[PDB]
Design a protein around this ligand. Structure first.
Ligand SMILES: *CC(=O)N1CCN(C(C)=O)CC1
Ligand SMILES: *CC(=O)N1CCN(C(C)=O)CC1
Lengths: 304, 304
C-alpha cells in the first residue's frame, strides 16, 4: 500500500550522461552508441541567445571545439551535425553503458522521469508530465540543459525529452531527441508565454482510482454523470475534455475497483465544484494530474 | 528555477539489489562486498509472522536454503548470521558494483530516497522522510521488503533504511542496515499503531525558503514571532517544537534570502492559523515537510 510520485530507476541513463563544453558554455550530453546528443545552444554565448543564427554560429565550430567528457575521460569527436535544435557529436568510442533505447515523442498528459544533471553529473531524479501547453514543471538550474526525460519498459529506455529553456514564468521547455521542441517554443531568449495550464483529466481520474485502491475513499459519492455533462464542468475548471478513449484507457482500473469511470467522473465533478473541504487524497490537498492510468497500474501491481 | 520532490540517482544502489529466496518467501537483498543484507523474516511463512521465534526458525536453515540471485546469476552462500532483524548472507563473490558506502541510522525529520524493488529488480525511486513517529510513508507491495533507503554524498551511498513492515494504517516500518527498527516496531504481525504524525517544522520552513527562492512569495507577511510564541502555535497544530538548533540549520537559507528565520516562522504561523485560502506554494496546497534544509540548499545550488 501507499502511492508515491515515483521516477524510473535512473542507472541506465546515468551511464549515458556526459559533459559537453563548446568555448565557455558547459551543459549535458546524452551518449548513446557513438553519438552524443546535446542542445545546439551549446555553441551560443548568453549574448548569442537573444537572436542566434545556429547555422552561421556552427560554421565557426570544428569537431575539436566540442569537448566531451564522460566522468574523467575525454571522448574524441570525429563528426558533428545539427538536427533541428540538437547537435549530434560522433565520437570514436561506442558508450559501453548504452542501454537498449528508443527515441519517442510523447503526447501532452504523458509522464516521464528526469535525471537532473550538471556538468554531465547526475544530481537527482523526479517525475514530470508533458503539460497540455507543452511545458514541463521541472527543477532545472543553469548547467542543467541536455538533462533528459525518459520512460523504461523492462530493459528499454525511451528518451522523450532533452532540457533546453526556462520561460520567465519558471516553467520548462525542451525537445524530443530529434531536437524538435514540444509546443511552439524556440531556443531563443525572446517573449515566449506558456498557454493555459489545463489539468490532465484522465490522469486525475487514474489517481482517484489509485486512492480508492489504497484506502482513501471519502470522495466517493452516490452520483454518476455523462461524458457531455462532466465535460461542461471540465470546461469551467480548465480540465482537458474527457473522451471515450480516456474512458477506454481507465477500463482496467474501473474493472479492478468495480467503480464505473462515469461514477468516478461524478466524484471528480463534486471535488471540482466543492473543493476538498480541508481534507487530503493520497497525502495531497489538490487533484494530482501527473500519474497516467499506466503509471497507476504499474505502481499498484509492482511492475519492474 | 522550479522545486521538485527529488530522489538521488539510483544507479549506485540498483547495482546492489539481489533476489533472496528462503523456501517459498522471495524478497530483496542488498549485496555490498561479499555480504547480502535482507530482512530476517525471509525465513518466515506468512503463518510464522504471527509469532515467529527467529533464532528457532533459523536453526532449521542452512547456507544452501538461501537462494541469492543477482539478475540471472546465482551467488554461492558460504555463511549466514542474524544481526538484530536482518540476515547477513556471506557469498563467495564481492559485488563488483559495490559503491563506496556507509550504514547510517538517520534521525526523524531526515529525508532519503527509496529504490522500490520486487524480486531484486528495481521498479522505481521516490523521496521519503523518517516521520517523527518513526514510520515512513512509502509505496511498498508484497515482495518489496529488503528495498533500501539511502542518501548519496558525491560518490558515497549512506544506507539508512531497509523495508520490513506495513502497519494496518498503510504506513511503513523498517530497520537501519544493522537490523534495528526505527521506532518501537517489531517484525511480527501484531497490533502496532503509529504514534502522532507530527509535521517536521524545520523542513516546512526550509521549503518556505525554497518557495521564496523560486518566486512563490504571497505568504510573506509584515510579522515576526519568537521561538516560544511560534512553539505555542506549533503545539496546537501537531508541529515539532522549533529549537535554536533548527534556527542555526536554517541560517544559510536565511542568509541567501535575507528573511530572518523568526520572520519566516511568523509566515508559517499565519499559514497554520489561516490555511492557504485555496492558493498553492511550489504547486502544493499543503505545507510540505519532506525537504530538509540540506535538501533545499542541494537542489537550489545544483550539487552533484
Ligand atoms: C553558460 C551558458 O551559456 N549556459 C549554461 C548552460 N545552459 C543551460 C541551458 O543549462 C545554457 C546557458
Ligand atoms: C511471501 C512472504 O512471506 N512475503 C513476501 C515478501 N515480504 C515482503 C515484506 O515484501 C514478506 C512477506
Amino acid at each position: 500500500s501507499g502511492f508515491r510520485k515515483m521516477a524510473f530507476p535512473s542507472g541506465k541513463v546515468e551511464g549515458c550522461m556526459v559533459q559537453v563544453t563548446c568555448g565557455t558554455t558547459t551543459l549535458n550530453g546524452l551518449w548513446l552508441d557513438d553519438v552524443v546528443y546535446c542542445p545546439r545552444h551549446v555553441i551560443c554565448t548568453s549574448e548569442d541567445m537573444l537572436n542566434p543564427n545556429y547555422e552561421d554560429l556552427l560554421i565557426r565550430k570544428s569537431n575539436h571545439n566540442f569537448l566531451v567528457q564522460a566522468g574523467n575521460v575525454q571522448l574524441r569527436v570525429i563528426g558533428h551535425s545539427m538536427q533541428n535544435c540538437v547537435l549530434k557529436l560522433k565520437v570514436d568510442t561506442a558508450n559501453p553503458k548504452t542501454p537498449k533505447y528508443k527515441f519517442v515523442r510523447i503526447q501532452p498528459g504523458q509522464t516521464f522521469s528526469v535525471l537532473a544533471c550538471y556538468n554531465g553529473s547526475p544530481s537527482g531524479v523526479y517525475q514530470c508530465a508533458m503539460r497540455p501547453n507543452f511545458t514541463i514543471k521541472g527543477s532545472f538550474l543553469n548547467g542543467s540543459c541536455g538533462s533528459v526525460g525518459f520512460n523504461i519498459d523492462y530493459d528499454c529506455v525511451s528518451f522523450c525529452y532533452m532540457h533546453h529553456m526556462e520561460l520567465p514564468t519558471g516553467v520548462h521547455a525542451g525537445t524530443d531527441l530529434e531536437g524538435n521542441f514540444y509546443g511552439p517554443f524556440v531556443d531563443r531568449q525572446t517573449a515566449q508565454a506558456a498557454g493555459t495550464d489545463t489539468t490532465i483529466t484522465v490522469n486525475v481520474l487514474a489517481w482517484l482510482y489509485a486512492a480508492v485502491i489504497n484506502g482513501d475513499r471519502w470522495f466517493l459519492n452516490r452520483f454518476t454523470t455523462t461524458l457531455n455533462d462532466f465535460n461542461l464542468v471540465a470546461m469551467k475548471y480548465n480540465y482537458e475534455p474527457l473522451t471515450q478513449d480516456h474512458v477506454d484507457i481507465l477500463g482496467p482500473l474501473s474493472a479492478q475497483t468495480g467503480i464505473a469511470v462515469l461514477d468516478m467522473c461524478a466524484s471528480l465533478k463534486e471535488l471540482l465544484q466543492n473543493g476538498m473541504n480541508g481534507r487530503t487524497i493520497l497525502g495531497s490537498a489538490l487533484l494530482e494530474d501527473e500519474f497516467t492510468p499506466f503509471d497507476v497500474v504499474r505502481q499498484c501491481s509492482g511492475v519492474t
